Structure 1
């Protein structure tokens, strides 16, 4: 066949992907990058020809063909030809070398004359000329221009530096450090004609094809690395750089190779890599005379490491001596003296790693350091469309550096270069709106850096931003978004406060640039409100609908969520995160093109889960399967992360995504209430006449004013709270209770006295307010707080007593206020011990009444208290009595799963497939069901520290529906209640609960 060899070339060459034929004749080869190289002589083939014979000719011709394309091109530029001309007809590898040789020649003479300025503009113009050519160019040649730009920037940078030198000695020093590409206008053996000088040392360009690789930006640091590599190689020693991950040590060795026309073979060591394969590859590298880099050599297993390290010595000892043949893998194999071994050394937990002893007198160790960013910044600004790239790069860096020294040391704050690359990345669309000016940079600083800052640091940013550079007075997209945001919130129930507008604005501007968004804040900050409000405002402003998928991240396993593979049958089933993407990608049957897709993760985020998606967070925007595939994500599809803390996540994960730190709650105590009330009234409209509703909403408004409550909520803090929850999150507990207690007595509000009516209202409100602030209190404290309520409420208004109650007649509508009445119990001998026996107390009735009231509200209940305090019985007996609710008992243990909860429910629940909610999970019988979760603070947490079972209940409490673990669909639970008992978490055995779950609970400490 012949054509079937092209597959295997990718491996044995590294640069090329597939080979080009005219069948009888080989016209050329194409690289993994897409670039097409054509040979000088097309190599003739016959059927009875061997692969080894024909391919060997190709390796030779592929190098010759590069020299041809190089000399052809170099000669052209020498004859005053614009570089824009050359690009279109010559392969990158060739044009790059031609530039380098001419550049070097042109600057070499320019050191003598000192005619730098004349050459500088000249170069600068070629840069601008290349840039504008790129905008209008075909994607393939688009790679080639960009790759060349990296180089031309290097050229001009060095010249500019050279212009600046105090003297000529200063210029000859700087020039010596640089990689100078010389050609011999003397000689034969053309493959050996090009050589490279640096620090006085020379190094022959071998002519291997490199294709068009992603070329690293030239840094002083990069040249120094190149300089150490050349210094080791000159004395026939191995190059080795140790240092922290992400310092680009292998990329350097890749680039150092390219600069010299070499495709480096990189061994990723200990990625479950066989010794047998490496031993083969080492023989091949010593024969073919290639460069091998050991990528993260440190990570090898001791048996392997010994064996490998000893082999490597053979090679490096063979070179230093120059032995023609060296023995390794117990066979006599010949050694090319062009061969080199490179070792990159990532650090361990213990320290920056070391080479094995034998390798210490065979290699030369060097310390890679992160690049001082200024130099990277300037080039990046140059590429976009500079304005003054030098001033911005100095100014941006100074400012970022300044923030770092001037802001508080906060965990998630990164003012490292990653951050400035990001400011710069965000800058490009921004430039489109405004200018390649500082002003566009200024805006991008506050688009990225500001959404992640917290109030103290928020001014430091503003103070030092104006201190370093002042740009402008007025902002675009100022009116238009804002009225679309106000209109969305009025509709949603929300209040546009300073902060809620702010964090809504911060968010709007970020979705634009960022595809992964993070929202971090305390439980009940306003996140769900911010994004649900902004996303809603965009369907008003753009006209694009949204399709939101809110998933609890840590309720499901990595297997339930990304895609789980079974070890033996290798049977691949979808998951949750991947399956909702296949609607958009695989079969966009309906309207997805014009829609916006948002997949929200409401639960705490951890390394293991984000690592399994890191590819979407990368510049890739594709999903990588454990087995089988990569699925690409559209620009519509945005992933949000709402969470309470970050401690677990990596700085690398933050800096890929857009981070939105909610310093404080978006909204005022009052404003919360306001929304809460109206949210409660809407529920009632479905089960209450408008005449009734209109009158009852009027009552609420005139009974409780904010001025009184402000002190009440303030005094709430001056109090000892078991199972602590903050004041702001306790609010929903008041209003939901209060409105239900008043809708309770609705009928007796028709005919009752208007002064007396207010007394019924005020009493209920004083009651509902008590359990919502002091319900989880000692009750020794409750009694104390009761007086505090009475104090701050109107003096004349019906005062609260410990056992204060409102009573109406058995057989006739009536109205009077009497408290503490008890039915009297007589039980037989056999009855004495029974799992369901209550001897009612003044306090059993007190708790059983309030406990029942909260369920009428349908707010979840946490009964916290000591063992044998009766929290289980009070809950059980109030409900074992009534026809309405039916109890279901689950005991939690240190390690209980979310399936146990489901299985216990399946016994008392019946799924119905009604088209109204799709799947629903009401109770197996008509009337309401109550899950009693006993020992709720018992199940343990992921090593990160996140109890999924609790988050699952939180899913049921907040979302009201959950995702099916195997079948992968949304089922909305109907009419089911969550109640829990727990012990004080000061007790041993006990686990601290997430505020994000306890916020939806009324807590009664008994």
Structure 2
């Protein structure tokens, strides 16, 4: 395509990202090349414009541009260094030169000044000067544009490294210790008396020198400088001095590849990263290796420990060839069945992840040419202080020490739990949530306290909350208060009492915690046993925010485990080469692509309302991370807008990885949000509003008054406590049987509304009480043996009043159209006779008292519009009783599905 693009010369800019790795486009002029621009967005202006005639090949002018960009970077560096040496403000020079040039100029100036400072041992003055520079950069960051903000942040990272080193040098007691510390720190120098400008600047660490190749790097994600990072740099430069390659091994997520890339950036190189175990072809890798050898770039094998055995052997042979050529000093090595030149600036790095067997090591042929090093997670205190210094926090050292001490204290005192993770990741999450809170309250200790109470506190259990509170009081001297209280609390109360929910202290506490957590977090997890109120909590908060802000809400409730990964994320027809959307990506595209609907002024919620497993979430881990992009296995890479928020409603995290818990805002429901006599009232109101559409006014008011005052929690609390004494098959706690009790009671009451108008008040109350007793018995003790059912009947007749009509084992309201009395009866015992030829049909049943009672209760449960579960030993007669109850009626048709050891979800649909 490039070869055929020798006339327009504008199709190369698409592949500039691939062939340069750092620059995304070439900024053109009407017939000249006026510069380049990187992926982050930054105009590098070439000093000498490149003419582009039509006859010139793409190869020739690309070749001249390759040197021109490096010469331009050196020119920017030289101009910036002189201006900085003159004494220009870092603020006035940021706007002129690219990030790399100002970075290198700063580093060289800092090294030069601190050398003489170490000679004279007067560190306080330069430390104060650097601190003032950092404060100036910090205040200029607030007034920065979209492009300059990244550059300012990177310069802040490097300047805080400078100040850290100067402070450590100042604290050193002896000159020997100061020089020991200065040896490890990566120093920068330039030769003022040399030709070949591109080789003027070099880097000295531990006495080893490395040339600075001036390849443009852009404005990359700078890593925070920590004493464990500089040890990685020292190991890499020690390996590179002796021409050995560079191997890192350690736990995943310790930034091995990022450390290699940061080392490359400091040296001015862009590191070509070969990603492994991504169905990575070998031939393309061999081509990349030949390119690395010929150019001289640094190639890093990310996750090298995961490769096919034959592919691993082939690539190890190639790497050994390259390394042998480098060590010997020979040129024109033999690989790819070809002799190719080998530039002596080539280098190979490898990062090995821990496998299933534990530790992973290099192949045998590479162990004699690679110097392995073990990477570890950084110390919490050092980078805690560094991040607090990234923000404008005062007393950042004391704050970081207090935060780390509090976290360790919590880990030592709080009760052990699966999701209790107080490592470095929790610290970084606390700081990231503390970052946006700076707008509301300043950069004091109370901001950290509020972030801790908004991150750690919700995820803690009930017994550990008091520990959190008292340790927070006794560690942090000041305990703050939250703002924006009255308005959102009143709005939550409105949105809850509108839906019937009871605004208890616990429910309001959980709603407030969820609201504050979703204020900043994007991925939410709600954990708690079935019936705690996760759905009620988040629905109430959604309604409250809709009423408060005025933004509309769009909710997509998806059950993850019902749908396979192909349906949830997207399926590709490998035999026909079409990609299908799936469910999650379809509703993401409907958000990004469409604008006619209310999608910019509305908050999108995707509630994964099912148990989560690592396999499902690893396909969206990029969404959970700071990337905030959904990376499909093939297709467009979808950006999630700020309104798009993912919630996870589950009941356990026994299979969710620590990474997902740390990234996602976790809200743990340690107890039910409402008491028994609040769920009962909510269900009563939800049934009254359903009956309201098919009933008169006064009759309904009187009936609901009778239902409400007929039972009281004083008598029912003893019943609910006694129900736990009974043995329950397929046990479910009574807080979940309340729904069945209330719904069945209300339906039974409503089914006899015709016989209530001409009914006396006393008999009406007796009817309501008897039906309530029946519903309570068949909901609480409905899954008992049958003798324990009689025991529960005695309990019911004891704890209710002694005047209401007693409930017997067969007490049923039978109503005759010729009489007005309720006429409650029991124990009919009918009789039936059948012929010989009817002895076995799938619909012949001998009616006994047990059969009639079971059929009656089953039909009453069906008419209550609630699902039923008949649990019993084989041959007991569950199917027979259903089919008899539904054969008599002309309203229901039975569809019998027979589940087996594995009935897929499409069996039911079929």
Structure 1-normalised TM-score? 0.87
Q: 2:82 aligns with which of 68, 75, 84?
A: 75
Report the CA distance shift for 1:354/1:626 in structure 2 as closer, same or farther (over 3 A): closer
Cα deviation digits, residues 484-509 of structure 1 (max 9, x gap): 11122111111111210110100111
Between 213-222 and 611-620, report the one with greater CA deviation. Answer: 611-620
Deviation of 1:728 after TM superposition, in Å, equals 0.4
Cα deviation digits, residues 458-500 of structure 1 (max 9, x gap): 1221121112103235321121111111122111111111210
Cα deviation digits, residues 786-841 of structure 1 (max 9, x gap): 22222322344433322233333353223433211033111111100000011011
Describe the SS at the equivalent of 2:16: helix
Deviation of 1:756 after TM superposition, in Å, equals 3.8
Q: Distance in 2 between matches of 1:637 and 1:236?
A: 50
Q: Distance in 1 between matches of 2:294 and 2:595?
A: 53
Cα deviation digits, residues 869-889 of structure 1 (max 9, x gap): 111111111111012333222
What is the match of residue 253 of structure 1? 260
Report the CA distance shift for 1:440/1:891 in structure 2 as closer, same or farther (over 3 A): same
Q: Distance in 2 between matches of 1:213 and 1:542?
A: 37
Unaligned residue ranges in structure 1 (runs of 5+)? 904-1006
What is the match of residue 27 of structure 2? 20
Q: Distance in 1 between matches of 2:692 and 2:444?
A: 56
Describe the SS at the equivalent of 1:404: helix
Report the CA distance shift for 1:51/1:586 in structure 2 as closer, same or farther (over 3 A): closer
Between 287-296 and 739-748, report the one with greater CA deviation. Answer: 739-748
Deviation of 1:82 after TM superposition, in Å, equals 1.0
User: Following superposition of structure 1 onto structure 2, how do residues 287-298 of structure 1 map, counting pairs within 5 Å?
Assistant: 287-298=294-305
Matched, 1:38 2:45: yes
Q: 1:623 aligns with which of 630, 634, 637?
A: 630
Cα deviation digits, residues 535-565 of structure 1 (max 9, x gap): 1112222222322222223333333333333
Between 429-438 and 635-644, report the one with greater CA deviation. Answer: 635-644
Deviation of 1:21 after TM superposition, in Å, equals 4.2
Cα deviation digits, residues 347-382 of structure 1 (max 9, x gap): 101011001112111111101001112222222222
Q: Distance in 1 between matches of 2:510 and 2:414?
A: 20
> Conserved in 2, the CA contact under 8 Å of 1:294 and 1:344?
yes
Report the CA distance shift for 1:195/1:573 in structure 2 as closer, same or farther (over 3 A): closer
Deviation of 1:573 after TM superposition, in Å, equals 4.4
Report the CA distance shift for 1:825/1:284 in structure 2 as closer, same or farther (over 3 A): same
Q: How many residues are matched?
A: 903
Q: Distance in 2 between matches of 1:646 and 1:627?
A: 30
Deviation of 1:429 after TM superposition, in Å, equals 2.2
> Conserved in 2, the CA contact under 8 Å of 1:378 and 1:393?
yes
Q: Distance in 2 between matches of 1:595 and 1:42?
A: 48
Report the CA distance shift for 1:894/1:66 in structure 2 as closer, same or farther (over 3 A): same
Describe the SS at the equivalent of 1:28: strand
Deviation of 1:519 after TM superposition, in Å, equals 1.2
Between 120-129 and 59-68, report the one with greater CA deviation. Answer: 59-68
Between 193-202 and 464-473, report the one with greater CA deviation. Answer: 464-473
Q: Distance in 2 between matches of 1:743 and 1:21?
A: 79
Q: 2:361 aligns with which of 342, 354, 361?
A: 354
Q: Distance in 2 between matches of 1:626 and 1:309?
A: 28
Q: 2:813 aligns with which of 806, 812, 818?
A: 806
Cα deviation digits, residues 763-792 of structure 1 (max 9, x gap): 222221111111101112112222222232
Deviation of 1:664 after TM superposition, in Å, equals 0.9
CA RMSD of aligned residues (A): 2.0
> Conserved in 1, the CA contact under 8 Å of 2:107 and 2:188?
yes
Q: Distance in 2 between matches of 1:808 and 1:20?
A: 90
Describe the SS at the equivalent of 1:862: coil
Cα deviation digits, residues 501-548 of structure 1 (max 9, x gap): 110100111221122221111111111111111111122222223222
Between 698-707 and 858-867, report the one with greater CA deviation. Answer: 698-707
Describe the SS at the equivalent of 1:436: coil
> Conserved in 2, the CA contact under 8 Å of 1:244 and 1:352?
no
Report the CA distance shift for 1:342/1:699 in structure 2 as closer, same or farther (over 3 A): same
> Conserved in 1, the CA contact under 8 Å of 2:758 and 2:820?
no
Between 405-414 and 614-623, report the one with greater CA deviation. Answer: 614-623
What is the match of residue 532 of structure 2? 525
Cα deviation digits, residues 427-463 of structure 1 (max 9, x gap): 1221111111110110000101111111112122112
> Conserved in 2, the CA contact under 8 Å of 1:847 and 1:874?
yes
Cα deviation digits, residues 884-912 of structure 1 (max 9, x gap): 33322222222223333334xxxxxxxxx
Q: Distance in 1 between matches of 2:143 and 2:820?
A: 85
> Conserved in 2, the CA contact under 8 Å of 1:515 and 1:657?
yes
Report the CA distance shift for 1:636/1:199 in structure 2 as closer, same or farther (over 3 A): same
Report the CA distance shift for 1:752/1:276 in structure 2 as closer, same or farther (over 3 A): closer
Q: Distance in 1 between matches of 2:38 and 2:101?
A: 14
Describe the SS at the equivalent of 1:473: coil
Report the CA distance shift for 1:636/1:868 in structure 2 as closer, same or farther (over 3 A): same
> Conserved in 1, the CA contact under 8 Å of 2:790 and 2:809?
yes
> Conserved in 2, the CA contact under 8 Å of 1:243 and 1:346?
yes
> Conserved in 1, the CA contact under 8 Å of 2:473 and 2:479?
no
Deviation of 1:296 after TM superposition, in Å, equals 1.1
> Conserved in 2, the CA contact under 8 Å of 1:430 and 1:440?
yes
Deviation of 1:390 after TM superposition, in Å, equals 1.2
Cα deviation digits, residues 300-336 of structure 1 (max 9, x gap): 1111111211221222222222223433334333322
Cα deviation digits, residues 260-293 of structure 1 (max 9, x gap): 1111111112311222222222222222222111
Q: Distance in 1 between matches of 2:816 and 2:35?
A: 101
Unaligned residue ranges in structure 2 (runs of 5+)? 1-7
Deviation of 1:216 after TM superposition, in Å, equals 0.9
Q: Distance in 2 between matches of 1:150 and 1:543?
A: 40
Report the CA distance shift for 1:729/1:466 in structure 2 as closer, same or farther (over 3 A): same
Q: 1:174 aligns with which of 148, 169, 181?
A: 181
Q: Distance in 2 between matches of 1:211 and 1:560?
A: 39
Q: Distance in 2 between matches of 1:134 and 1:126?
A: 12
Report the CA distance shift for 1:237/1:725 in structure 2 as closer, same or farther (over 3 A): same
Between 70-79 and 150-159, report the one with greater CA deviation. Answer: 70-79
> Conserved in 1, the CA contact under 8 Å of 2:450 and 2:482?
no
Between 636-645 and 824-833, report the one with greater CA deviation. Answer: 636-645
Q: Distance in 2 between matches of 1:888 and 1:869?
A: 20
Q: Distance in 2 between matches of 1:3 and 1:92?
A: 26
> Conserved in 1, the CA contact under 8 Å of 2:814 and 2:822?
yes
> Conserved in 1, the CA contact under 8 Å of 2:100 and 2:217?
yes
Q: Distance in 1 between matches of 2:438 and 2:186?
A: 34
What is the match of residue 512 of structure 1? 519
Q: Distance in 1 between matches of 2:197 and 2:797?
A: 100
Q: Distance in 1 between matches of 2:480 and 2:37?
A: 53
Describe the SS at the equivalent of 1:578: helix
> Conserved in 1, the CA contact under 8 Å of 2:282 and 2:311?
yes
Cα deviation digits, residues 184-221 of structure 1 (max 9, x gap): 23322222211111112221212222222111111111
Q: Distance in 1 between matches of 2:662 and 2:733?
A: 31
Q: Distance in 1 between matches of 2:641 and 2:297?
A: 41
Report the CA distance shift for 1:583/1:206 in structure 2 as closer, same or farther (over 3 A): closer
Q: Distance in 1 between matches of 2:416 and 2:464?
A: 10
> Conserved in 2, the CA contact under 8 Å of 1:848 and 1:878?
yes
What is the match of residue 237 of structure 1? 244
Report the CA distance shift for 1:430/1:20 in structure 2 as closer, same or farther (over 3 A): closer
Deviation of 1:106 after TM superposition, in Å, equals 0.7
Q: Distance in 2 between matches of 1:447 and 1:842?
A: 59
Deviation of 1:41 after TM superposition, in Å, equals 2.9
Deviation of 1:566 after TM superposition, in Å, equals 2.4
Between 496-505 and 556-565, report the one with greater CA deviation. Answer: 556-565
Describe the SS at the equivalent of 1:890: coil
Q: Distance in 1 between matches of 2:682 and 2:56?
A: 83
> Conserved in 1, the CA contact under 8 Å of 2:763 and 2:822?
no
> Conserved in 1, the CA contact under 8 Å of 2:214 and 2:268?
yes
> Conserved in 2, the CA contact under 8 Å of 1:520 and 1:645?
yes
Q: Distance in 2 between matches of 1:750 and 1:19?
A: 87
Q: Distance in 2 between matches of 1:432 and 1:822?
A: 77
Deviation of 1:567 after TM superposition, in Å, equals 2.5
